[PDB]
Amino acid sequence: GVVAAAEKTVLYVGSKTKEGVVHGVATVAEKTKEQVTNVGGAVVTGVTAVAQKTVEGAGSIAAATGFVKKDQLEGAPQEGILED
Amino acid sequence: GVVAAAEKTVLYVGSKTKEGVVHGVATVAEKTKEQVTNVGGAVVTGVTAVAQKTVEGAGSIAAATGFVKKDQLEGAPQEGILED
Amino acid sequence: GVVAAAEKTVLYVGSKTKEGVVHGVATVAEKTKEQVTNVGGAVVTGVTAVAQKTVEGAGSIAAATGFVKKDQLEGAPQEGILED
Amino acid sequence: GVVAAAEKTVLYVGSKTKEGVVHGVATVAEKTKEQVTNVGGAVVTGVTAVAQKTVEGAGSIAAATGFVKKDQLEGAPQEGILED
Amino acid sequence: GVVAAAEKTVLYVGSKTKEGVVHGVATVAEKTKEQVTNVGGAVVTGVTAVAQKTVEGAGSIAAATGFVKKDQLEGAPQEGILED
Amino acid sequence: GVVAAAEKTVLYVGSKTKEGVVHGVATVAEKTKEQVTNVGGAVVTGVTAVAQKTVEGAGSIAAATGFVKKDQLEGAPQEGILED
Amino acid sequence: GVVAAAEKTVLYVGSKTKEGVVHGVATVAEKTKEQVTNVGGAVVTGVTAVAQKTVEGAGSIAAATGFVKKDQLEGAPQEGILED
Amino acid sequence: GVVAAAEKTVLYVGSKTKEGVVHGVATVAEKTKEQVTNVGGAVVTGVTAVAQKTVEGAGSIAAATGFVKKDQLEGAPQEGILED
Amino acid sequence: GVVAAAEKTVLYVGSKTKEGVVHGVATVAEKTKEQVTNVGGAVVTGVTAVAQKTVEGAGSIAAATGFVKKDQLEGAPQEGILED
Amino acid sequence: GVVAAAEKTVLYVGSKTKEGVVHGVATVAEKTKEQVTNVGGAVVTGVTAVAQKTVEGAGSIAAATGFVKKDQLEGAPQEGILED
């Protein structure tokens, strides 16, 4: 793996790794408006400076699935009515 | 793995790793408005400076699933009525 | 694993690892408004400077599931009526 | 594991690890308003500077599930009526 | 495990680990307003500077579940009426 | 000056002023080193969250003058010798 | 000056002023080192959350003057010798 | 000056001024080193979140003057010798 | 000046001014090194989030003057010798 | 001046001014090195988020003058010798 060896008989020996890293982030937001309206699904908004490492599995960042329907032998409606 | 060895008979030996890390983050938010309205699902908003490491499983950050329906042998409605 | 060895017969030997870490975060929020209204699901908002490590399981940060319905042999409604 | 050895016959030997850590966080919030209204689900808001390590289980931070319904052989309604 | 050994025949040998730790946090909140209204679920707000380690179980911080309903062979309503 | 008047025959009348004010300050300092060496002058360091108001005089914050020499009818030496 | 008057024949009349004020300050310092060495002058360090008001004079915060020498009809030496 | 008047026969009347003010400041400093060496002058470093108001005088923040020499009818040396 | 008047026989009347103001500042500094060496002058470094108002005088922020010499009827040397 | 008037017999009347103001600033600095060496003059470095208003005088931010010499009826040397 990540090994460092020196055999003396100034000196520098080094091994370094980086996986899933986020450095310096600077952000300014002044006059922001955000509306979210959902009825029967999934919504993901506003994800900033996120890091991850997964070894023996599934890695997911900002993932949205509306719905999972695995039935066996009723429906699944959604109704976003808006009027004026 | 991450090993460091020196054999003397200035010296520097080093091994270093980084997995799932977030450094310096600077954020300013002045006049922000946020509305969230949901009826039958999932919503994730505003995730900042998050880190993770998972070894023998599934890693997920900011994940939204509306609903899971695994029945066996009724429905699942949602109604977001808005009027004026 | 993470090992450090030196054999003498200035010297520096070092091994260091970092997994799931968040460093210096500076945040200013001045005039912020937030509205949340949900009826039958899940909502996650405002997650900042979070770190985790999981070894033999599932790691999840800011995860939302609307509902799980695993029946066997009624419905599940939601009604967000708003008027003016 | 994390081992450090030196064999003498200035010297420095060191091994150090970090898992699930949060460093210096500075936060200012001046004039913030927050409204939360839920009827039949789950809501998580405002999570800051949180760290965790789990070894033989599931680790979750800021997780919301609306409801779990595993029946066997009625419904589950929710009604957020608002008027003006 | 975490071991440190030295064999003499200035010297420094050290091994140190950190799991689930939160360092220096500075927070100022001046004029904050917060409203929470729930009828039949779960709400978690305002979690700051929290650390945990779990070995043979499930670790969860700021987790909300609306309700668990595992019946066997009525309903579960919720009604947040607001008017003006 | 700052006056407020109301003449009735909900009401709000208000006059407010702010001069030399410092609001919410959050600061974290983790591993800081500072060396100061002076021989014949003035040094000012590390001034944070300071406010002042002066009306009929001179206002000064973090002011350094090396020396004032107003003689009338010897010298003024300084010697910062450093060696290795 | 600061006056408030109301003439009735809910009501609110108010006049308020602020001069030289410091609000909420939160500070964390973990591992800090500071060295100061002076021989013949002035040093000011580490001034935090200080307020003042002066009306008919000179206001000064964290002010350093090395020395004042107003003679009339010897010298003023300084010697910071450091060796190794 | 700053006046507010209302003449009734919801209402809001307001006058407000701000002079020399500093709002929310968030700062993180992790591994900082600072060396200062002066022999015969003035040094000012590290000034943060400072406010002032002066009316009939001179206002100065972080001002450095090496020296003032107003003689009338000897010298003023400085010697920063450094060697290796 | 700053006046607000309303004559009733929802209403909002307002007058507001801002002079010399600094709002939300977020700063992160991780691994910073700073060396200062002066012999016979003035040095100003590191000035952040500073505000001022002066009415009948001279306003100066982060001002450096090496020296003032107004003699009347000796010299003023400086010697920064560095060797290796 | 800044006046606001309304004559009733929703309404909004407003007058607002801003002079010498700095809003939201976000800054990250990770690995910065700075050397300053002066012998007989003036140096100003690192000035951030500074505001000022001056009415009947001279306003100056980050101003450097090497030296003022107004004599009347010796010299002023400077010697920055560096060798290797």
Numbering used by the authors:
A (entry chain J), B (entry chain H), C (entry chain F), D (entry chain D), E (entry chain B), F (entry chain C), ...: 14 to 22, 37 to 100, 105 to 115
List sentences from the manuscript.
α-syn is a 140-amino-acid protein mainly expressed in the presynaptic termini of neurons and plays a significant role in the trafficking of synaptic vesicles and the secretion of neurotransmitters. With abnormal conformational changes, α-syn can further self-assemble into β-sheet-rich oligomeric and fibrillar interspaced structures. The transformation and aggregation of α-synuclein are characteristic causes underlying the pathogenesis of Parkinson's disease and other neurodegenerative disorders. Here, we find that a recently established α-syn fibril strain, “B”, markedly prompts the co-aggregation of tau protein in both neuronal cells and in vitro settings.
